[PDB]
Structures are given as structure tokens and as C-alpha cells.
Design a protein around this ligand. Structure first.
Ligand SMILES: O=c1ccn([C@@H]2O[C@H](COP(=O)(O)OP(=O)(O)O)[C@@H](O)[C@H]2O)c(=O)[nH]1
Ligand SMILES: N#C[C@@H](O)c1ccc(O)cc1
Length: 474
């Protein structure tokens, strides 16, 4: 019999990426895979890159099925409207997914298809676990961000119990002294402050979607057969040991993409700029500041201008990925100082890049990052120190660990100002600060390589997951 694994990501590129990594590995190991897209995600991908590039090749088409489910969303809903996405998916996708499972079962008789043997749902996509359990199909969940991020979400309930969520005083939502308050009761992260919790807790709404959905997700994941985390156990050991008490067995597989590399489908709405790596080839080793904020976050036009002026005055060449819709509001021209540096060849601004390859390029010496987890995993594998500007979600949690525990990063002020940006970049490029963070980044690069190579801790967890949980085919 052939195992048949159905995988269901949340519609964001940072969620699709790790589940697609796993789906391709399972297909390589001989499994049948059904990858489930929401119609929102599928139609947006089609209009950006065309059906041929989004769907599987003909060589893999036999055992790699793409299925699409309804979600009731307009394609106009932007990626930064996380609450709108989350609320529609949890309300609209369960019955479409239940129907999909039924049809996959009918295809056993109808076309000799393999019965479904496991569902791997993103933790967010609680309907996938609900439908699998109803149908008596094993399900395992994949949390796509950091362990420390999960630990913060897990403690949303405790915030509610302590009267901290919802915020009873709206004036405290952005009060920096209040947000600095230590939360000494979080196991595994004694240094958590209120601001270091994933940012969706900062709400006055007692029916807030993201708080509600978080609680649903934690309860769902606690009932799963296992939890997959795309992190390095050695990096997040104290956090993972604290999470162990609240979840089924946890498999730390990170960086999954590097485990796979040790040993045909576009998942992005943006086209990776091919000039990047050639431009970096022309720059000295370690000389370039690489700036990128991932696939969902947006910033203000004022923040964008201060980043631009800071980059122009920081003393280093720079590669800035400025996502086409990253700035809120109408298009504003970049400052002349930056535009002149681009004209001189000292800087380069592109809409999207091949991020893992850029971070591994010898010309890059620093990553200015929003602290999205996949981006941090790519920085960790590459050995790049991080200058952090967290935006939303668990980016704040990740930044707290980058600064206080992992040791491979430093933080910018949330209020962007060109002079402080230039000063901190300079410190990271030539100061004792950067020497320390870069040295620690080198240590984590070695640790990641050891974990991902055959026999390493993450490699061993991937083998156990792939074999004993997913290819069993009972
Ligand atoms: O120029 C870019 C920037 C990002 N990414 C990819 O987009 C995802 C960003 O995920 P992350 O978890 O860092 O952040 P999010 O987008 O969820 O904020 C990762 O797979 C990156 O490799 C990319 O392909 N090109
Ligand atoms: N930010 C962000 C997204 O990655 C996200 C989606 C759903 C969640 O429940 C939490 C976070």
C-alpha cells in the first residue's frame, strides 16, 4: 500500500513554504501527497505566476495532487489583514474540507487511489484536525513559526486569566513602559515582557479574532498525534522543554530545508529578482547590508523614508528588498541620497529576491530583518547576524530571544530614525557589537549544519517523522 498524506497550510508564504518542503520530501520517499490550497491562495497564485508554474510537473503529477477548497474570501483581502483571513478560514473551510476528504475516499474505489492515511495540518488550520478526527484519520500538526513564538501563543490563556487581555485601558496598548512589564511566570522564557508576547494580544476587543483563534489553535494542537516544529532544538532548548508538558510529542526538524538539502512549483506571488546575486558578486566579502521584511508586513511611508536615509548614510553598500506593497498608501519616491547611491552602484533596491541564496552570498555581512521565522532560519543556516525590526505576530518574541538568548542579533528602535539606523548598522558592520553577534551567528551556523547533516538531531527527527508517522500507511 502507498501512504497518502494530505497537507493543509495557512495561506501565507511563510506557512506554505515549510509544508511544501515536507510535501516534496514525502513525495520523494514514494508517498502520495495531496496539497490543499484555499481558493484565495490558489487564484492569487494563478493570476501572478500562471497555472503551469503553480501546479506540479508531469513527472510528479501521478503522486502529487493539488486540491482547492472554498474559503469565502475576496482575493482583495491583503496579507497584512491576518484577522480577516483567520476568521474567514475557520468559519468557511471546514465543510469544504470535509467534502474533500469524502471525495478522496470515493476515489479509492473510483480510480484505485490510495486511502488517506494521515493529515498534516498547519496549527492555524484547525478545521483540518477536526475533519481528520471525524473521519478517523490520524492527524499531526505543523507549527510554522518559532518555538518561542508558540510558547507565547500558548500563554494567551494565562494573559486572559490575569486580566491582561483584553486590555482594559486602550491608552496602554502602545504605552512603552506598560509593554515593558516583565511576565515572570512564563516557563522557559523567564525574561518575557508583555511586549515580547506575539503582538495580537494587544487588543481591547473581548471578541478579538486573533485571541479567540489562538486559543482554539492551542486546544487543537494539544489533541494532535504529534507536533512538528521547524526549529533547532539546541537553539530553543529551554523553550521546547517547557512546551513538552502541553503538547503531544514534539519533533524539532529545523532547518527542514537544510535537512532535505543534505539528503518545480511556485508558491509566491512575487518574482524573485535574478540580478541580485550578480550584483553581490561585484562587492567585497562581508560588505553588504541586506534588508528584507518578509511577505506579510507593511510599514508607513515615513518609516520607509527613514530606513532609506539610514541606509544611505550607514557607510556600507546595501541590497534592499522593498516588496512592491510593503509601504502603506500611495507610492512615494526614495530619497535622492539613496537614489544616487543606486546610480553609483553602491546600493540596489529590488522587489523580491532568492532569500536563502542571498543570505549565503559571501558579499553579505548583515541581515536587517522583520524577524519572520523562515527568514531567521535562513539567516541562521547562512551564519548572518541580524539587526531586528519586529513588526507583528511572534516577531517580537523572536527578537527578544535573538537579543537575550540566542545572541546572534541586536534590535533597532521601533520608531525608525535615519541617524540611529545608520549608527546601529555601522556598529553591526564594524563595531564590537557586530563582532559579537557575528561570532555567535557563526556558532549557530555550525550547530545548524551538524543538526541537519545525516545523523544530526534534526535529521534524526525528520527520519522519525517521515517514516514512523507519515509513511506508515496503516
Ligand atoms: O525576497 C524575499 C523575501 C522572503 N522570501 C520568502 O518568504 C518567506 C517569508 O517567511 P517568514 O516566515 O520570514 O515571514 P512572513 O513572510 O510570514 O512574515 C520565506 O519563505 C522567505 O524565504 C522570499 O522568497 N523572497
Ligand atoms: N502574523 C502572522 C501569520 O503568520 C499568522 C497567521 C495566523 C495566526 O494564528 C498567527 C499568525
Amino acid at each position: 500500500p502507498t501512504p497518502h498524506v494530505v497537507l493543509v497550510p495557512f495561506p501565507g508564504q511563510g506557512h506554505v513554504a515549510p509544508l511544501m518542503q515536507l510535501a516534496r520530501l514525502l513525495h520523494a520517499r514514494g508517498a502520495r501527497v495531496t496539497f490543499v490550497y484555499t481558493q484565495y491562495n490558489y487564484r492569487r497564485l494563478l493570476r501572478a505566476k500562471g497555472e503551469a508554474a503553480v501546479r506540479p510537473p508531469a513527472t510528479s503529477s501521478a503522486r502529487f495532487r493539488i486540491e482547492v477548497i472554498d474559503d469565502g474570501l475576496s482575493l482583495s483581502v491583503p496579507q497584512n489583514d491576518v484577522g480577516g483571513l483567520v476568521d474567514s478560514l475557520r468559519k468557511n473551510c471546514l465543510h469544504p474540507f470535509r467534502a474533500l476528504l469524502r471525495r478522496l475516499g470515493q476515489e479509492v474505489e473510483g480510480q484505485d487511489a490510495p486511502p488517506v492515511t494521515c493529515v498534516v495540518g498547519d496549527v492555524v488550520m484547525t478545521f483540518a484536525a477536526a475533519a481528520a478526527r471525524e473521519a478517523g484519520i490520524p492527524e499531526v500538526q505543523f507549527f510554522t513559526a518559532s518555538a518561542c513564538g508558540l510558547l507565547g501563543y500558548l500563554h494567551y490563556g494565562e494573559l486572559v486569566e490575569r486580566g491582561l487581555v483584553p486590555f482594559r485601558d486602550a491608552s496602554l496598548l502602545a504605552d512603552d513602559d506598560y509593554l515593558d512589564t516583565p511576565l515572570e511566570w512564563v516557563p522557559g522564557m523567564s525574561h518575557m515582557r508583555l511586549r515580547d508576547m506575539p503582538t495580537f494580544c494587544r487588543t481591547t476587543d473581548p471578541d478579538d479574532v486573533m485571541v479567540s483563534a489562538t486559543l482554539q489553535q492551542m486546544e487543537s494542537a494539544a489533541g494532535s498525534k504529534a507536533l512538528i516544529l521547524n526549529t533547532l532544538y539546541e537553539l530553543e532548548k529551554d523553550v521546547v522543554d517547557a512546551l513538552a508538558a502541553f503538547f503531544p510529542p514534539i519533533y524539532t526538524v529545523g532547518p527542514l530545508a537544510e535537512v532535505i538539502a543534505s539528503s518545480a512549483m511556485d508558491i509566491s506571488i512575487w518574482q524573485e529578482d535574478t540580478r541580485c546575486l550578480s550584483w553581490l558578486d561585484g562587492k567585497p566579502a562581508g560588505s553588504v547590508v541586506y534588508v528584507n521584511f518578509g511577505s506579510m508586513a507593511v510599514m508607513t511611508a515615513a518609516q520607509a523614508r527613514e530606513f532609506a536615509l539610514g541606509l544611505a548614510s550607514c557607510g556600507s553598500p546595501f541590497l534592499w528588498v522593498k516588496r512592491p506593497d510593503v509601504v502603506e498608501g500611495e507610492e512615494v519616491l526614495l530619497p535622492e541620497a539613496l537614489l544616487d547611491e543606486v546610480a553609483r552602484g553602491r546600493g540596489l533596491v529590488v522587489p523580491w529576491c532568492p532569500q536563502a541564496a542571498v543570505l549565503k552570498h559571501a558579499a553579505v555581512g548583515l541581515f536587517v530583518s522583520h524577524c519572520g521565522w523562515n527568514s531567521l532560519l535562513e539567516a541562521t543556516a547562512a551564519g548572518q547576524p541580524v539587526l531586528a525590526w519586529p513588526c507583528h505576530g511572534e516577531q517580537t518574541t523572536n527578537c527578544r530571544q535573538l537579543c537575550e538568548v540566542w545572541g546572534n542579533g541586536a534590535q533597532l528602535p521601533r520608531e525608525v530614525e535615519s541617524g540611529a539606523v545608520a549608527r546601529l548598522v555601522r556598529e553591526m558592520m564594524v563595531g564590537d557589537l557586530g563582532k559579537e553577534k557575528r561570532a555567535k551567528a557563526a556558532e549557530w551556523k555550525a550547530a545548524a549544519e551538524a543538526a541537519a547533516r545525516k545523523g544530526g538531531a534534526s535529521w534524526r527527527n525528520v527520519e522519525r517523522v517521515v517514516n514512523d508517522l507519515l509513511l506508515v500507511g496503516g
